[PDB]
Design a protein around this ligand. Structure first.
Ligand SMILES: CCCCCCCCCCCCC/C=C/[C@H](O)[C@H](N)CO
Lengths: 285, 243, 111, 240, 114, 41
């Protein structure tokens, strides 16, 4: 009686997997009309010709483990993400903008997935640059985006009124913290197409391209607690272990070498192949 | 009874007689925004028939020595139709897509394309400096309605080799079996809604793998079109016009 | 960068040894694949130049067993054991890491 | 208090261990999740996706021509078309697939494989192609009447355009250490030669070469064991 | 596999020479073409390279504005040279070949001389 | 299965996942093909 036309599911199903799949026996087939080997790769779906339908197989109960391939145990190994150099006696402190894109061993793994979400866990190993290891005091602050970056060796930002701080010596075992998930979006994203602002974007060199604002996570500052300026050189080696991780939207793996931190350039003068060359096509070794 | 298929969205059907199948992307239908996800507190203004219909782009020619082509979505629709006048006024944006690529040939031609859908597709510069440093222009990162060409199709302008690029949703256009390919993509993004002019979500790619060969006397100009169409799109957050 | 072939005039005797070297260089290991390039080149005075040892050590096909070359860091050597009546041209060294590709000066042979 | 002596293992720092550590932000509630499609749960949903091999990795082919194997109308029968190895984790054709880039983060693979072929030829051109496979021990086979002893699937062109050989798991050990050399040739797995069955017959005014694209994947009982750190990485700086 | 340049012609100040070459015996859309000049009794110099598919010209910085390349699809090179000659550029202009995907060595074959 | 702090992100690794469903990456087609039939029919 009123206006009528105002009134007018998925495909995947999750299955628990404990071991690998089994194998059921078979026999020979002499019959037309039921062909399992022929496929069609144009339809985009991969084939599904299991080996019970090609060759005569035997009944094999399988007991291997599929535990060490889930992504919780795949990322939970700690690798280097940064190095902070400290020279004293000539400003006194040192800063490091938090960016895990720097060192290549953990960059290449974390680009397999597009949107991730985890909880990090840091560890700061600190050595004098000649293996001396004498006992001093150190202070590691953490400046969130907006707080003033400290300017001098003894300015008034080093008071630790709000933001965290870790006091540790040189002879103790290295420190360890547990940073939670700190993004304003729902998930960290590594690949952000699109300019960050509005306005008008130039033709020659737009350095704003692809800068994701959902990852600008601050600064990590460190000085040596003293009044008199001591005279020593240092390095720290900040390691990172991921945990409780969840990933989304897989993508292929980088194959060309890297050139910059923030930007994914390559060098088109010389492109390296994937497979190293052989003599002809008609021989194996 | 499985080749012939007719897709009808809005008021514009597409019939075909030599199709293969229809590929969902990651197995989930494009749906609206449930109320455990929405963060805007103003009512979204969803139209239904005005901006859900097939728009046809411009047809590139495929020759002997071609490299590739690529478009960016939803950049390509910001000038045509009512959808071009609801992505300029409105700040937010949310939709799905439903692609379709025609390329027909005779029986004595050969060759094969590769139609893919790559989420968060970044173009990289091509210079061996380490700081100044090269960067892609504005007419390359957002090509418009035409769509530029690849310079290096073997590494996809990102240092990603082509042989591993079947992990994305894709269909083949093999010119002996089918002549059209269809992908249906849901909305893949981190934040629930999205800005419409800067953050372009994903990018279609057509790369000719086995190149076109034909004997003497056949017709030499084989063109390639695209036919996209949004699905269940809703907008929100009105303001003045910014192109 | 720049290259310096250290002997612009080396005068060997047949059945003797040579050491043509370019001591002056930069790091020259970049292009980030490892693989410092540093190719060598003959030039017989009537023809086009030809290849020789193409990386630091590896020989190119057709080059005889006499042409041996090694080195590391910023030091690079050629060592040939039997100077024949053909190995008489001019020797060049071509680096290929950085963008302005440089060929160095040269090296003569006369006896 | 309670008496507690200490142990060896004190004051060390093992990387791959999972223990607690003191948080920095007390009382923190993160930004809530929303539904995002396409979630993975393992790295065995990424080994079952067919990608493109790189079979024509010879001296004279450069670029997109590397990905495909050429066929042509031969003068005789019995001829050979291509040949490669089965070793995910050895340099050669498997280095440009998702199996070859994941089975280098791990050691000791297992389970079956499969290889899918696709023919990109014309419409009016037919033929047949034997697809052989032979377990190790000897060299690469010589003529076709020797390579029809192993597993083989005879493939015929038509309206369909794919056959998918399932390379079985025939091995003495339960795993295979996925490395080659001299002493590690005890873990190799034989050759996958393609032979012309009859010929490639073509009507007049039709192009006279077609191209077979080879693909590759993994089956359902595929497991990996020990996580190591890979070798295809390259750096000498800090990426300034 | 040969690279056949043009015949040597002397040109005074204020013209272009447009020295060509022709790739003979292989697939021309799969190789770079460099350009190397040889000063008289002196060292070699590099000019720049043309990529035979997708264009992509790159020079030195000592030769910008002059010697702007072109390309032909009928198996022929840039055939290009300096617009403003001087008195010292009576050199010999070679042309070479380089594989697209890298084989770890450059400059395999060589051309003639003008 | 123990946690000494009163926050949830400071704990160790949680329980095993043990679930997977590869049909959203192998075969995401509408007309579901079977194993024993001609797929373009
Ligand atoms: C005393 C503790 C000082 C160290 C505190 C560090 C807290 C910041 C860590 C947040 C997690 C890493 C930041 C985000 C990760 C990647 O860098 C970004 N996603 C880059 O895209």
């Amino acid at each position: 009686d009123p206006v009528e036309d105002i009134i007018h599911r998925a495909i995947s199903s999750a299955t628990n997997v404990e071991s690998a799949a089994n194998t059921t026996p078979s026999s020979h087939r002499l019959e037309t009309g039921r062909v399992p080997a022929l496929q069609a790769a144009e339809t985009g779906a991969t084939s599904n010709a299991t080996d019970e339908n090609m060759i005569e197989t035997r009944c094999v109960v399988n007991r291997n483990g599929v535990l060490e391939t889930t992504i919780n145990h795949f990322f939970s190994r700690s690798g280097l993400v940064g190095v902070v150099n400290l020279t004293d006696g000539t400003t006194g402190y040192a800063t490091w903008d938090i960016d895990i894109m720097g060192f290549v061993q953990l960059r290449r793994k974390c680009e397999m997935f597009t949107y991730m979400r985890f909880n990090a866990e840091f560890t700061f190993v600190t050595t004098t640059e000649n293996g001396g290891a004498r006992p001093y005091m150190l202070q590691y602050m953490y400046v969130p985006p907006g707080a003033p970056k400290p300017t001098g060796r003894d300015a008034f930002q080093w008071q630790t009124a709000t933001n965290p701080s870790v006091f540790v010596k040189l002879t103790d075992p290295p420190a360890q913290v547990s940073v939670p998930f700190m993004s304003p979006a729902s998930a960290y994203q590594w690949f952000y197409d699109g300019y960050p602002t509005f306005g008008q974007h130039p033709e020659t060199s737009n350095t704003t391209y692809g800068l994701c604002p959902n990852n600008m996570m601050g600064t990590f500052a460190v000085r040596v607690v003293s009044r008199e300026a001591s005279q020593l050189k240092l390095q720290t080696r900040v390691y990172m272990k991921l945990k409780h991780v969840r990933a989304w939207v897989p993508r292929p793996i980088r194959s060309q070498p890297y050139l910059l931190k923030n930007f994914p350039n390559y060098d088109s003068s010389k492109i390296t192949n994937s497979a190293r060359d052989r003599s002809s096509i008609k021989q194996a070794n | 009874s499985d080749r012939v298929a007719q897709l009808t969205v809005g008021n514009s059907s597409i019939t075909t007689q030599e199709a293969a199948n229809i590929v969902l992307a990651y197995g989930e239908w494009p749906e609206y925004c449930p109320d455990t996800d929405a963060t805007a507190v103003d009512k979204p203004t969803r139209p239904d028939v005005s901006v859900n219909r097939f728009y046809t782009l411009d047809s590139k020619m495929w020759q002997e020595n071609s490299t590739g082509w690529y478009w960016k979505f939803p950049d390509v629709l910001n000038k045509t139709g009512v959808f071009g006048q609801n992505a300029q006024f409105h700040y937010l944006y949310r939709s799905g897509f439903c692609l379709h690529v025609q390329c027909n040939a005779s029986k004595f031609h050969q060759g094969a394309l590769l139609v893919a859908v790559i989420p968060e597709f970044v173009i990289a510069g091509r210079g061996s400096n380490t700081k100044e440093a090269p960067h892609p222009g504005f007419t390359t990162t957002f090509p418009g309605t035409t769509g530029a060409t690849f310079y290096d199709p073997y590494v996809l302008d990102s240092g990603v080799p082509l042989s591993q690029a079947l992990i994305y949703p894709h269909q083949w256009i093999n010119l002996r079996t089918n002549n059209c390919a269809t992908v249906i993509v849901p909305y893949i993004n981190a934040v629930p809604f999205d800005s419409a002019i800067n953050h372009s979500n994903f990018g279609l790619i057509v790369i000719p793998v086995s190149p076109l060969k034909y004997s003497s006397g056949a017709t030499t100009a084989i063109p390639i079109t695209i036919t996209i169409a949004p699905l269940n799109s809703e907008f929100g957050g009105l303001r003045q016009a910014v192109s | 960068d720049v290259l310096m072939t250290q002997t612009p005039l080396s005068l060997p005797v047949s059945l003797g040894h040579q050491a043509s070297i370019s001591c002056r260089s930069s790091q020259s290991i970049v292009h980030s694949n490892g693989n410092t390039y540093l190719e060598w080149y003959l030039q017989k005075p009537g023809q086009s130049p030809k290849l020789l040892i193409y990386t630091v050590s590896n020989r190119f096909s057709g080059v005889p067993d006499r042409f041996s070359g090694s080195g590391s860091g910023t030091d690079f050597t050629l060592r040939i054991t039997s100077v024949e009546a053909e190995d008489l041209g001019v020797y060049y060294c071509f680096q290929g890491s950085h963008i302005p590709y440089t060929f160095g000066g040269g090296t003569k042979l006369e006896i | 208090g309670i008496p507690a002596e200490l142990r060896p293992g004190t004051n060390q720092f093992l990387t791959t261990d999972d223990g607690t550590a003191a948080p920095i932000l007390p009382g923190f509630t993160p930004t809530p999740t929303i539904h995002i499609p396409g979630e993975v749960h393992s790295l065995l949903e990424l080994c079952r996706v067919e990608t493109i091999l790189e079979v024509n990795n010879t001296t004279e082919a450069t670029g997109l021509t590397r990905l495909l194997i050429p066929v042509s109308s031969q003068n005789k029968a019995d001829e050979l078309c291509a040949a490669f190895m089965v070793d995910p984790g050895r340099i050669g054709p498997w280095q440009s697939t998702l199996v070859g880039q994941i089975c280098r983060y791990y050691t000791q693979w297992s389970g079956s494989l499969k290889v899918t072929f696709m023919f990109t030829g014309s419409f009016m051109a037919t033929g047949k192609m034997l697809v052989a496979y032979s377990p190790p021990g000897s060299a690469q086979p010589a003529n076709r009447e020797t390579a029809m002893l192993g597993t083989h699937v005879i493939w015929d062109f038509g309206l369909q355009s794919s056959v998918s050989l399932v390379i079985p798991w025939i091995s003495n050990t339960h795993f295979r250490t996925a490395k080659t050399g001299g002493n590690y040739d005890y873990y190799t797995a034989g050759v996958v030669t393609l032979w012309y069955q009859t010929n490639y017959v073509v009507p007049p005014e039709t192009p006279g070469e077609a191209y077979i694209i080879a693909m590759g994947a993994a089956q359902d009982n595929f497991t990996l064991k020990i996580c190591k750190d890979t070798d295809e990485v390259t750096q000498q700086a800090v990426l300034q | 596999v040969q690279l056949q340049q043009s015949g040597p012609d002397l040109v005074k100040t204020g013209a272009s020479v447009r020295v060509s070459c022709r790739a003979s015996g292989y697939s021309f859309t799969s190789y770079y073409i460099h350009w190397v000049r040889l000063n008289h009794g002196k060292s070699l110099e590099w000019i720049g390279y043309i990529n035979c598919y997708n264009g992509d010209i790159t020079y030195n910085q000592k030769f910008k504005g002059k010697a702007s390349f072109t390309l032909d699809t009928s198996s022929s090179t840039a055939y290009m040279e300096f617009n403003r000659l001087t008195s010292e550029d009576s050199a010999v202009y070679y042309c070479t070949r380089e594989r697209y995907g890298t084989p770890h060595y450059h400059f395999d074959v060589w051309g003639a001389g003008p | 299965n123990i946690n000494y702090y009163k926050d949830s992100y400071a704990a160790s690794a949680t329980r095993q996942d043990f679930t997977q469903d590869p049909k959203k990456f192998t075969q995401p087609v509408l007309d579901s093909i079977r194993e024993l039939s001609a797929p373009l029919n």
